[PDB]
Design a protein around this nucleic acid. Structure first.
Length: 17
RNA sequence: GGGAUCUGUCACCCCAUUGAUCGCCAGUGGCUGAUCUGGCUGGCUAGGCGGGUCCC
């Protein structure tokens, strides 16, 4: 089953160890 | 050479587009391409590399 639709939201907030 | 702490950089996941902004072509239309905020009191007792300091 295919699915179309994304939240299109950022996934990077840490940007650090 | 190892371990611990700190910093920088890089790669992802979840919730809120049903919230917000930009560009192009035509009147209703079409297009992820890019950007924004909040939760790090969600995950480093998930990963890699460099530098400084301490200890051996």
């Amino acid at each position: 089953g295919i699915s179309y639709g994304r939240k299109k939201r950022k996934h990077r907030r840490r940007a650090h160890q």
